[PDB]
Design a protein around this ligand. Sequence first.
Ligand SMILES: [Cu+2]
Ligand SMILES: [Cu+2]
Ligand SMILES: [Cu+2]
Length: 500
Amino acid sequence: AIVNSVDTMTLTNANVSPDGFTRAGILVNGVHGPLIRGGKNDNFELNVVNDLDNPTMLRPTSIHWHGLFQRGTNWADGADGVNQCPISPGHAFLYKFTPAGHAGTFWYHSHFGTQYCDGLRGPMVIYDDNDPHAALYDEDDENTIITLADWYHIPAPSIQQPDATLINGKGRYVGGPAAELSIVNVEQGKKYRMRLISLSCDPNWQFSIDGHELTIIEVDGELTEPHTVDRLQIFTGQRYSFVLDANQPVDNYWIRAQPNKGRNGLAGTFANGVNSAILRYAGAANADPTTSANPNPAQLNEADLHALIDPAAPGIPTPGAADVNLRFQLGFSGGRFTINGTAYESPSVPTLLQIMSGAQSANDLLPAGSVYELPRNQVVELVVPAGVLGGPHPFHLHGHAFSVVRSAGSSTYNFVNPVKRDVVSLGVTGDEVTIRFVTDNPGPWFFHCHIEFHLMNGLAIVFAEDMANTVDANNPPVEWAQLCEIYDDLPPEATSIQTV
Ligand SMILES: [Cu+2]
Ligand SMILES: [Cu+2]
Ligand SMILES: [Cu+2]
């Protein structure tokens, strides 16, 4: 169950039934989404061995280590088509990188097509030896992690709405068997750093724990001042650490994660234990909770979250006064999502290899219309107005965390101490989510909607950041460029997809 910072991750197919329904899925070292853990200065060496052979799911793979900036290791970032070609079935690839002092709650997932929706994803926690919030809790370990995952009864390639919400890999579907629910154990009077992670391919969840508050202290691998709420909405790939103060009577309490969509009314109920897990106090019975949610919760508003360390947003504290000011117009036309009129389509040679081969400017890079060059060591402000169908769209920027100077639902800006994070919901029509970051990381980085079906239908762009220093900054192993030659040589039967 635990993958260490130096380890092997062997990918196989197996039949799984996390909600009591059996289907074929993907395992990592014989386990469903095992935790990867390490320390902030660790030199990670993860040999990803692709032994996938079930043709009803994608077989080639690529792993993204979500939230790690990968400075100087752009070739390990994992987005197929941008940072590497996929690792082919029967071959392996050794990713090497370091958090470089960046502690936090992260997650890993395939970044090849919609494969992570089939289960190739898991939590990744990087602990700090000098954590600023250490006095606020007693415990923080493999038992204080709470993952949320959308689970479908049909393999991703054959999707025509989630059948279940899995909490720590377990959950029920409407009309399903009374499958075992996950248990989070706590002892009255103790305080826990609970690390809540969305492994979602699509849905967002309204998360709450009956009788308890959530004291948020970390957001997407970035510390915040402690901000307490009763309920929060968490979007694809976001993470929150909240201190859970086990200050209620010894009892069982429902953990609730209500999705925005789902089959057979899953979005609107908790009946029969769907969308649920159990918080059990030591001494309480081996039984389900009979608790109810707070009927008047304080709901998280992202604009209330404030960065703790180096809080100021970069640049002149005036909207549109960054060094580089980009406004992106999302669209949906002719069956595909577009950004500034162009639907993202993966190139035949991954962006980083295009640059290592000689591309000097964005004009030389493919695909045309999807690549935006950024200069070195400048402040970039991106404005991405909501409105395009299928929202709310949670966009994620690889290579950087950003300050959200203007969140959804707010008309106000905060340049003094806005929250920093790496996935942000663009909100609804009228919202103009605005984020800032510094171009301190040479290499090509994806910027896209993390709803996997949207990314696959075109909602993405690539930033070719500091092209001139990209070759000097990054030194891929010889096996990295060899991925594309091995991949491009694959016979038709090695990549065929059996629809079911
Ligand atoms: Cu991700
Ligand atoms: Cu989207
Ligand atoms: Cu991505």
